[PDB]
RNA sequence: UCCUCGAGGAGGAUUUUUGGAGCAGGGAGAUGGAAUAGGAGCUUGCUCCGUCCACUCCACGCAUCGACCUGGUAUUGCAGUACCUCCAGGAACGGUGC
């Protein structure tokens, strides 16, 4: 029903987030709030026509995230049960 | 009292009068400037006034370093790898130093981003045609010893020793 | 004019930019001490003038004495003491051991003598046209005797400080 | 919540409003709204060439309101 | 109230994608069309899908330079992804799984 | 096999066809509401008067119970009546109660109504709310909505029967007639009111009477209103004889032989006495100790032969043996006229053996002496001995 | 005529061939099947039109309220 | 119901501040009215935009919808803003 | 004080032709007669016409349901 | 649950990237539900621009990361 | 009211977060270049066509203000600041509307 409870239970997983400006940040999801505030640690960000930069921490808002990319070994069938 | 990581981590850091992040490292009497990797290029200015540094070298790669205060020291030689470690170095205050010859200003020509240089209160400034040699060797510098470089001084520097 | 932490320089070149002149004044004042603030305006009332407020009053006095009449951007700037106190300094604020003083003004209170002796570090006590100032340190008392020998305070008379005898 | 904007002092005063896309209008306000909607009676809009065109009483929504400058001393 | 509006309104067109396990296409604002099976949905159109194929077209964008060369189309595949309902512009359901 | 131990507990029972007393309320033939009220009230073990009155009221016969004050006679009259009302439900007719409880006082009637409401808790059965000296309109409005039991005053019941507010029909109206404090109802003051209450009643209906005291004339007056009554009091069933004097002394196990030697030496308890023992070997040792102390004594137990026991019984009957030691087998059934003294040096585990040993001496209206030595090990039988002494009047 | 609210007008437009044009310039023409209270549209046998020219048929098309600019009942 | 940056913006009313809009327009002057929805109404304001068209107006009103940032003096960053 | 909702109700009762400008689109506007309105500023225009100022053309559509999130300015015209 | 993602970076120098491509490096002091950041003595990089105490709205924020140690 | 085995215990519709965002830089000239990176006429040389920068021409794309450089010129003034004298030339930069 609510996607925020499913996104909050995806902690300690290496995922990727593509923004609306073409910047893709790949990192381990460590913190998710009700407003989809993605706080990741040891992330790598690649902007549009720029070099990738590695950061120890990153905080991306929910309104600035356009798409997400999860690994194929993620238990989406078990995490969907509330 | 050498410059270490514990001395840089315990030093005060704040905002200067030009709204830049400056760390006050004065009153330490460091004989050699080293172990600057603990700052991780988080400071825009370096306040190393009233020290005992003999050579301005041994600095790591810091792209955010734009101002360097080396006043009231005994700096007599400049390192040749200053451009590879500070590409954005624009302010260099070397007043009251131990520079005696103009040949120490030859590694200072590699800093293309340097625009403000201070070489006052030095025996190298008392030599003949020191300002013309500093204008000819460093054309990127616009302000030398709190004086704006004019076109006539550039023409006089380009005429002699061509 | 009493010495303060803020030194005001005037008769400078007003054709340069405000930020470049402020950076040049900060680079000039960094050789004498830590510059806490730099007040520089370019309006019709404050044209061609600026001021630097430092942490210590001795560094500001040395910068006013050394750079008196120094050529700054083609024009020799004149440095002097500030009339009032700075706002940042007001926000941040709120041989022998005994020295003999002669030809002291009788209208000066103990607070003015304490503010005059505050250039040296903390002393033991003060005694009040003759006065006796005793410091806790010998080197601080020697520096206070060497500094107050002909100081510029109450210029109608001349103050003389000498070391006490046994 | 839902506090109305402080538009009581700018009532019946000739002000110039800026709208998105680079639009400029000038007119007298005739009311207020909690959704930042302004009614400008006898409004005149500035064209691209510089000529003013009178559009009469218009209604400007708060979604495209950029800046409103009062041309009269209040 | 909410379940009847979700099973009788436009969201039922999403609910036919997860119940019958059909493939639908989503055209986004970045000129990209992703065809896939909708696995999880919500009220804010948060679509978590699996086995998606995203196709678009790109220009060289001053790649080499001198005044004669054309853009080209491209496509890629993702195992599992999740897209928010803000960037979803068009959603088309078509019998393409059969 | 312990059915005699419930009757020996001290509960005089009289009548023909009396049912067995129940051990607990869970196996007494009660309904779920009565068991729920007994569990909510905190009753872990039922009263013996209640255990004697509840099967007699559940069987449908008339019962007359007498006990001490505060023994739970109201609960013993309310619980089997509510159990029979819940198990055998009938149609609640207009102005007709299923039970009639007679109380001599208004406060006692209010307490009986409160006990009936507590026994019928968490149910739709509301019995009565009426008392003397109050408004009759509120009582008539409370009784007109439905009345299961009728617990009130005889004067208020006569006023309700005279004004056609409450009466007993002929075919099927009430099945139980309760009478609380029947000693006051059978007196000269409440005689015609109780007579008019018992005359206008159903023929097929049980009559229950409970009181703290019961004279002979009041019991003879109350027995005429009931049909084949069952009496239940304390104590008569398996009780000690009142003609034999019972004495209990607190002594040790080793001091019992010294007390018996002092009673045989100083007092006249050596000749013509029967001494009860615990075992046969202890009885033989006591007989050998009595024979070694220059006293003629005989013994009769299971370890000896039948001919030797018959010779010992003949010597005790003729007068050849002064004392006769015997086990618990010779305590009951033995009828010897020479047995005047009964010395119980070893206390038995059951009170029936002690009652048989006390009743063996001083029978057929004659007097007798019974002296028992109570030790610290027989702590469980001390309450039974105290109950037997209270029932026999010792 | 009588002032009609847009919600019964959207409820009564179901089953009729309409065309919804978005802010990007593209339009979808088809029979309106579902219209909820959040101004969302779901149509069947939709055809795409761009710059006055037809693109192709898609079938059941779902358009949200954040992208749809206008709708016209044909 | 009231935020701490909203309280800091409401407490800074009456000082020489500036508000830079999303289009680049910087309205500078004394903040006369500051509501909870970032509505900045200033008197004797000055327009210095990213376009650079610097002018002086008697009164200006910028809403919080197109407001990008606000430059305030550092007189209220010490107390009671220290948490 | 004149409310905008009261002005919209008076314009719907008068049945006058009004022109609506779009948000971030100055080249094309709409024009028509508003019949009804709602709380979300949804206009129902009868015999509406899209006027393009760049091409100087007018394309009629008919009954149009314009949302209030796109209409930035609305003025009254005499035509 | 704990909501300690914004409280751990309090009183620290962070660099927030805007939507138009600007970067504001300042000391984050407080926040709110609308992600309103108050950066005292912040620098604007894209060149250096002296700004100071800049109160940027949460609608123009994209990403934020740690810059260095607290002063 | 709950637990234990009838009982016991106690919030996608105007100012913030489900986005009104995406895309392209005017035209011409036997102009010039793809060291290692286009295809075809199946290397190399040549010819043709859907990607930039430099200069020239039409319509220095246009007008605006801010920052900035040269020369001349005025102000000598004690303050906590969007920015600060004026004239003329050049236009390397920013954004606004067409």
DSSP code string of F277-303: -SSHHHHHHHHHHHHHTT--EEEE-SS
Tokens 């089997």, located at residue: F80
Is F313 in the same domain as F221? no
Helix axes of F255-265 and F280-292: crossing angle, nearest 10 degrees: 50
CA dihedral over H70, H75, H81, H82, signed as positive or negative: positive
Name the minimum distance, in Å, from the CA of B100 to any CA of chain J.
Answer: 35
Number of domains in chain I: 1
Tokens 């950066």, located at residue: J39
DSSP annotation of F247 reads: E
- The domain locations on chain J are 1-71
Interatomic separation, CA of residue A37 and C1' of nucleotide K20, rounded (Å): 24
| Domain with H70 in it | 2-83
Strands C78-81 and C98-102: unpaired
DSSP code string of G12-73: HTTTSEEEEEETTSEEEEEEEEEE-TT--EEEEEEEEEETTEEEEEEEEEEE-TTTEEEEEE
Experimental technique, in short, is: cryo-EM
Q: Which of F210, F232, F254 lies at the terminal end of a domain, its last residue?
A: F232
DSSP code string of chain E: -HHHHHHHSTHHHHHHHHHTT-EEEEEETTS-EEEEEEEE--TT--EEEEEEEEEEEE--SSSS-SS----EEEEEEEEEEEE-SSSEEEEEE-S---
Query: Which residues does chain C have within 8 Å of residue B69's beta carbon, measured at their own beta carbons?
Result: 27, 30
CA dihedral over B77, B79, B82, B83, signed as positive or negative: positive
Interatomic separation, CA of residue J7 and C1' of nucleotide K11, rounded (Å): 24
Instruction: Report which of I56, F348, A69 is spatially closest to residue E82, judged by C-alpha positions.
Output: A69
Instruction: Report which of G12, G17, G16, G37 is spatially closest to residue G27, judged by C-alpha positions.
Output: G17
Is F147 annotated to bind ligand?
A: no
Residues D53 and D45: beta-carbon distance below 8 Å: yes
Residues F312 and F300: beta-carbon distance below 8 Å: yes
Q: Does E83 reach chain A within 8 Å, measured CB to CB?
A: yes
Residue E27 phi, psi (nearest 5): -95, 125
| Domain with C56 in it | 1-94
Q: What are the contacts of E59-63 at 24+ separation with CB within 8 A?
A: E61/A49
Is F348 in the same domain as F326? yes
Contact B/J (≥3 CB pairs under 8 Å): yes
Name the minimum distance, in Å, from the CA of H70 to any CA of chain J.
Answer: 5
Q: Does A65 reach chain E within 8 Å, measured CB to CB?
A: yes
For residue F104, the domain's CATH number is: 3.40.50.300
CA angle G59, G61, G63 (to 5 degrees): 165
Q: Does D62 reach chain H within 8 Å, measured CB to CB?
A: yes
Is F170 in the same domain as F261? no
In this complex, do H67 and J41 lie within 8 Å of one another by their Cβ atoms? no
Number of domains in chain F: 2
DSSP annotation of F18 reads: P
Residue H80 phi, psi (nearest 5): -90, 35
Query: Which residues does chain E have within 8 Å of residue G59's beta carbon, measured at their own beta carbons?
Result: 92-95
In this structure, what token pair is assigned to residue G36?
């909820």
**What is the rounded end-to-end Cα distance, in angstroms, of chain C?**
36
Residues F12 and F234: beta-carbon distance below 8 Å: yes
Is F307 in the same domain as F375? yes
Which subunits count as partners of chain C given 3+ CB pairs below 8 Å? B
Q: How many CA atoms, within 13 angstroms, populate the side-chain half-sphere of residue E33?
A: 13
Is F358 annotated to bind ligand?
A: no
Residue of H5, H23, H82 to mutate for J, most J C-beta atoms under 10 A: H5
Is F223 in the same domain as F336? no
Q: In what order do the strands lie in the sheet with F149-152?
A: F13-14, F230-232, F63-66, F206-211, F176-180, F99-102, F149-152
Judge residue C156's burial from the number of C-beta atoms within 10 Å of its C-beta, 0-12 exposed, 13-18 middle, 19 or more buried. exposed
Rounded distance, CA H18 to CA C146, Å? 51
DSSP annotation of C23 reads: H
Rounded distance, CA B125 to CA B118, Å? 10
Query: Which residues does chain D have within 8 Å of residue H45's beta carbon, measured at their own beta carbons?
Result: 69
In this complex, do G5 and I36 lie within 8 Å of one another by their Cβ atoms? yes
Rounded distance, CA C143 to CA C102, Å? 17
| Domain with I34 in it | 3-77
Rounded distance, CA F50 to CA D46, Å? 107
| Domain with A73 in it | 1-82
Q: Does G42 reach chain E within 8 Å, measured CB to CB?
A: yes
Residues F238 and F307: beta-carbon distance below 8 Å: no
Query: Which residue among C27, C37, C72 places its CB closest to the CB of B118?
Result: C27
Is F394 annotated to bind ligand?
A: no
How many residues are given for chain G? 74
Residues ≥6 apart with Cβ < 8 Å to E52? E34, E35, E36, E77, E78, E80, E81
Q: Which alpha helices (DSSP H) does F101-181 contain, by range?
A: 106-119, 136-144, 154-162
Measured CA to CA in angstroms, residue F300 lies from F263, F311, F342, I60 at distances of: 21, 9, 15, 135
For residue G68, the domain's CATH number is: 2.30.30.100
List the nucleotides on chain K closer than 7 A to a protein CB: 6-8, 11-24, 32-34, 37-38, 49-53, 64-71, 73-85, 94-98
Q: Pick the residue from chain J with its C-alpha nearest to A9.
A: J1
Is F70 annotated to bind ligand?
A: yes
Query: Which residue among H3, H9, H74 places its CB closest to the CB of J34?
Result: H3
- The domain locations on chain E are 1-98
**Nearest nucleotide, C1' to the C-alpha of B151?**
K70
Which subunits count as partners of chain B given 3+ CB pairs below 8 Å? C, J
Q: Pick the residue from chain H with its C-alpha nearest to J50.
A: H71
Instruction: Report which of F73, F60, F56 is spatially closest to residue F19, judged by C-alpha positions.
Output: F56
Cis ω for the linkage preceding G55 (within 30 of 0) = no
Query: Which residue among J30, J33, J55 places its CB closest to the CB of H70?
Result: J55
Name the minimum distance, in Å, from the CA of E36 to any CA of chain G.
Answer: 15
Query: Which residues does chain J have within 8 Å of residue A24's beta carbon, measured at their own beta carbons?
Result: none
Contact B/C (≥3 CB pairs under 8 Å): yes
Number of domains in chain D: 1
For residue A51, the domain's CATH number is: 2.30.30.100
What is chain A's Cα-based Rg? 13
Query: Which residue among H1, H23, H45 places its CB closest to the CB of D66?
Result: H23
Q: How many CA atoms, within 13 angstroms, populate the side-chain half-sphere of residue F142?
A: 19
Q: Does B61 reach chain J within 8 Å, measured CB to CB?
A: no
Nucleotide K76's nearest residue (CA vs C1') is C11
Q: Does E44 reach chain A within 8 Å, measured CB to CB?
A: yes
Rounded distance, CA F114 to CA F318, Å? 66
- Extract the runs of DSSP E, i.e. beta strands, from chain F: 13-14, 63-66, 99-102, 149-152, 176-180, 206-211, 230-232, 244-250, 273-276, 297-300, 323-326, 341-344, 368-374
Examine residue D1 and state whether it is found in any structural domain, yes or no.
no
Is F146 annotated to bind ligand?
A: no
Q: Which CATH superfamily is domain B1-162 in?
A: Ribonuclease Inhibitor (3.80.10.10)
DSSP code string of B29-72: --SS---GGGSTT--SEEE--S----EE------TT--EEE--S
Strands B45-47 and F63-66: unpaired
CATH number of the domain located at residue range(s) E1-98 in this protein:
2.30.30.100
Residues F16 and F228: beta-carbon distance below 8 Å: yes
List H residues 26-65 in contact with D (Cβ-Cβ < 8 A): 27, 33, 35-37, 39, 41, 45, 47, 57-63, 65
Helix (H) or strand (E) holding F86: helix F73-87
Helix axes of F106-119 and F32-41: crossing angle, nearest 10 degrees: 110
DSSP annotation of F349 reads: S
List I residues 25-44 in contact with G (Cβ-Cβ < 8 A): 30, 35-38, 40, 42-44
Rounded distance, CA H63 to CA I3, Å? 19
Query: Which residue among A1, A68, A72 places its CB closest to the CB of E79?
Result: A72
Rounded distance, CA E45 to CA C124, Å? 78
Q: Pick the residue from chain I with its C-alpha nearest to D44.
A: I75
Residues ≥6 apart with Cβ < 8 Å to C114? C126
Query: Which residues does chain E have within 8 Å of residue G37's beta carbon, measured at their own beta carbons?
Result: 5
In this complex, do G3 and I38 lie within 8 Å of one another by their Cβ atoms? no
Number of domains in chain A: 1
Examine residue F239 and state whether it is found in any structural domain, yes or no.
no
Strands B67-69 and B91-93: parallel
CA dihedral over B2, B6, B10, B14, signed as positive or negative: positive
Q: Does I68 reach chain G within 8 Å, measured CB to CB?
A: no
Residues ≥6 apart with Cβ < 8 Å to F333? none
CA dihedral over F101, F104, F109, F115, signed as positive or negative: negative
Question: Residues B92, B97, B99, B104: what is their CA dihedral angle, to the nearest 10 degrees?
Answer: -30
Which subunits count as partners of chain J given 3+ CB pairs below 8 Å? A, B, H
């Amino acid at each position: 029903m609510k996607l925020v409870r499913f996104l909050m239970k995806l902690s300690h997983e290496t995922v990727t987030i593509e923004l609306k400006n073409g910047t893709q940040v790949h990192g381990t999801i460590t913190g998710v709030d009700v407003s989809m505030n993605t706080h990741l640690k040891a992330v790598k960000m690649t902007l549009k026509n720029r070099e990738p930069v590695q950061l120890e921490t990153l905080s991306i808002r929910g309104n600035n995230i356009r798409y997400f990319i999860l690994p194929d070994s993620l238990p989406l069938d078990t995490l969907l049960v509330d | 009292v050498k410059l270490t990581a514990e001395l840089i981590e315990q030093a005060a850091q704040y905002t200067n009068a030009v709204r830049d992040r400056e760390l006050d490292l004065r009153g330490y009497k460091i004989p050699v400037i080293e172990n600057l990797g603990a700052t991780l290029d988080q400071f825009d200015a370096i306040d190393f006034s009233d020290n005992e540094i003999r050579k301005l070298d041994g600095f790591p790669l810091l792209r955010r370093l734009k101002t360097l205060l080396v006043n009231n020291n005994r700096i007599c030689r400049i390192g040749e790898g200053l451009d590879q470690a500070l590409p954005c170095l624009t302010e260099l205050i070397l007043t009251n130093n131990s520079l005696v010859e103009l040949g120490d200003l030859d590694p200072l020509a590699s800093l293309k981003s340097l625009t403000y240089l201070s070489i006052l209160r030095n025996p190298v400034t008392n030599k003949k045609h020191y300002r013309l040699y500093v204008i000819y060797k460093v054309p990127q510098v616009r302000v030398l010893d709190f004086q704006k470089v004019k076109l006539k001084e550039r023409q006089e520097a380009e005429k002699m020793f061509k | 004019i009493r010495p303060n932490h803020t030194i005001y320089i005037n008769n400078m070149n007003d054709k340069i930019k405000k930020e470049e002149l402020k950076r040049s004044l900060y680079a000039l004042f960094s050789q004498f001490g830590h510059v806490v603030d730099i007040v520089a305006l370019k309006t019709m009332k404050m044209r061609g003038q600026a001021f630097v407020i430092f942490k210590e009053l001795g560094s500001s006095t040395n910068a006013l004495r050394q750079l008196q009449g120094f050529p700054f951007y083609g024009k020799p700037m004149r440095i002097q003491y500030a009339k009032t106190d700075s706002d940042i300094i007001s926000k941040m604020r709120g041989p022998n051991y005994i020295l003999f003083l002669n030809n002291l003004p009788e209208e000066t209170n103990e607070m003015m003598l304490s503010m005059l002796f505050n250039q040296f570090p903390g002393f033991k006590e003060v005694r009040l046209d003759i006065a006796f100032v005793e410091f806790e340190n010998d080197g601080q008392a020697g520096a206070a005797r060497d500094a107050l020998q002909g100081f510029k305070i109450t210029p109608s008379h001349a103050m003389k400080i000498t070391y006490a005898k046994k | 919540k839902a506090h109305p904007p402080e538009l009581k002092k700018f009532m019946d005063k000739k002000l110039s409003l800026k709208l998105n896309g680079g639009r400029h209008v000038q007119g007298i306000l005739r009311g207020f709204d909690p959704f930042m909607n302004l009614v400008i009676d006898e409004c005149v809009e500035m064209a691209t060439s510089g000529q003013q065109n009178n559009i009469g009483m218009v209604v400007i929504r708060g979604n495209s309101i950029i800046m409103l400058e009062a041309l009269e001393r209040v | 109230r909410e379940e009847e509006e979700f099973n009788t309104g436009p969201l039922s067109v999403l609910t036919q994608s997860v119940k019958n396990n059909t493939q639908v296409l989503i055209n986004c604002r970045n000129n990209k069309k992703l065809l896939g099976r909708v696995k999880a949905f919500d009220r804010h159109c948060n679509m978590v899908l699996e086995n998606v194929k995203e196709m678009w077209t790109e220009v060289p964008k001053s790649g080499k330079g001198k005044k004669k060369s054309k853009p080209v189309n491209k496509d890629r595949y993702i195992s599992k992804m999740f897209l928010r309902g803000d960037s979803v512009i068009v959603v088309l359901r078509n019998p393409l799984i059969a | 096999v312990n059915v005699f131990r419930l009757e020996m507990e001290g509960i005089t029972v009289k009548g023909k066809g009396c049912p067995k007393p129940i051990k607990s309320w869970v196996q007494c033939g009660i309904s779920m509401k009565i068991l729920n009220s007994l569990k909510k009230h905190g009753y872990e073990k039922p009263t013996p008067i209640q255990t004697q009155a509840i099967p007699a009221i559940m069987s449908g016969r008339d019962l007359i119970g007498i006990a001490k004050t505060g023994s739970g006679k109201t609960i013993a009259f309310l619980l089997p009546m509510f159990r029979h009302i819940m198990d055998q439900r009938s149609l609640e007719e207009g102005e007709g109660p299923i039970a009639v409880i007679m109380t001599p006082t208004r406060e006692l009637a209010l307490q009986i109504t409160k006990e009936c409401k507590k026994f019928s808790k968490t149910l739709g059965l509301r019995v009565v709310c009426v008392y003397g000296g109050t408004g009759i309109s509120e009582q008539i409005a409370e009784l007109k909505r439905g009345a299961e039991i009728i617990v009130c005053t005889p004067g208020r019941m006569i006023d309700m029967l005279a004004a056609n507010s409450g009466r007993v029909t002929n075919l099927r109206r009430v099945t139980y007639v309760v009478l609380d404090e029947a000693d006051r109802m059978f007196d000269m003051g409440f005689e015609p009111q109780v007579m008019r209450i018992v005359d206008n009643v159903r023929p097929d209906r049980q009559t229950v009477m409970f009181s703290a005291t019961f004279p002979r004339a009041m019991e003879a007056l109350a027995r005429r209103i009931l049909s084949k009554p069952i009496e239940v009091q304390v104590g008569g069933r398996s009780v000690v004889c009142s003609d034999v004097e019972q004495q209990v002394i607190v002594i040790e196990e080793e001091k019992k032989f010294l007390k018996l030697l002092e009673l045989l030496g100083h007092y006249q308890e050596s000749g013509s006495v029967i001494i009860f023992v615990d075992k046969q070997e202890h009885a033989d040792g006591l007989l050998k100790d009595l024979m070694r102390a220059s006293y003629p004594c005989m013994s009769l137990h299971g370890g000896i032969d039948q001919y030797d026991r018959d010779s010992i019984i003949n010597d005790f009957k003729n007068g050849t043996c002064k004392l006769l030691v015997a086990t618990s087998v010779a305590a009951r059934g033995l009828d010897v006229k020479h047995l005047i003294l009964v010395v119980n040096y070893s206390c038995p585990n059951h009170y029936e053996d002690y009652v048989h040993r006390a009743g063996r001496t001083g029978r057929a209206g004659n007097k007798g002496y019974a002296y028992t030595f109570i030790t610290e090990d027989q702590a469980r039988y001390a309450g039974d001995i105290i109950k037997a002494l209270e029932l026999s009047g010792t | 005529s009588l002032p009609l609210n847009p919600k019964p007008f959207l409820n009564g437009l179901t089953g009729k061939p309409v065309m919804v044009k978005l802010k990007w310039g593209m339009e979808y023409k088809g029979y309106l099947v579902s219209v909820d209270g959040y101004m969302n549209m779901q149509l069947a046998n939709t055809e795409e039109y761009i710059d006055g020219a037809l693109s192709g048929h898609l079938g059941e098309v779902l358009i949200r309220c954040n992208n749809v600019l206008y709708i016209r009942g044909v | 119901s009231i935020g701490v940056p909203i309280k800091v913006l409401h407490e800074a009313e009456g000082h020489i501040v500036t508000c830079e809009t999303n289009t680049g327009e910087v309205y500078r002057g004394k903040l006369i009215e500051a509501e909870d929805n970032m509505n900045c109404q200033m008197s004797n304001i000055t327009v210095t935009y990213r376009d650079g068209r610097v002018a002086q107006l008697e009164q200006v009103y910028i809403r919080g919808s197109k407001i990008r940032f606000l430059i305030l003096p550092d007189m209220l960053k010490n107390a009671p803003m220290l948490k | 004080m004149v409310q905008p909702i009261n002005l919209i109700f008076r314009y719907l009762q008068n049945r006058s032709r009004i022109q609506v400008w779009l948000y971030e689109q100055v080249n094309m506007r709409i024009e028509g007669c508003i019949i009804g309105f709602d709380e979300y500023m949804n206009l129902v225009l009868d015999d509406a016409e899209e006027i393009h100022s760049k091409t100087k053309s007018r394309k009629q559509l008919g009954r149009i349901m314009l949302k209030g999130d796109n209409i930035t300015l609305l003025q009254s015209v005499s035509n | 649950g704990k909501s300690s993602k914004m409280l751990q970076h309090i009183d620290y120098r962070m660099r927030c990237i805007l939507q138009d491509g600007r970067i504001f490096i300042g000391t984050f002091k407080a926040f709110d539900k609308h992600m309103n950041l108050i950066l005292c003595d912040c620098d604007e990089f894209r060149e250096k621009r002296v700004l100071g105490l800049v109160l940027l709205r949460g609608e123009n924020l994209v990403s934020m990361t740690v810059e260095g140690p607290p002063p």
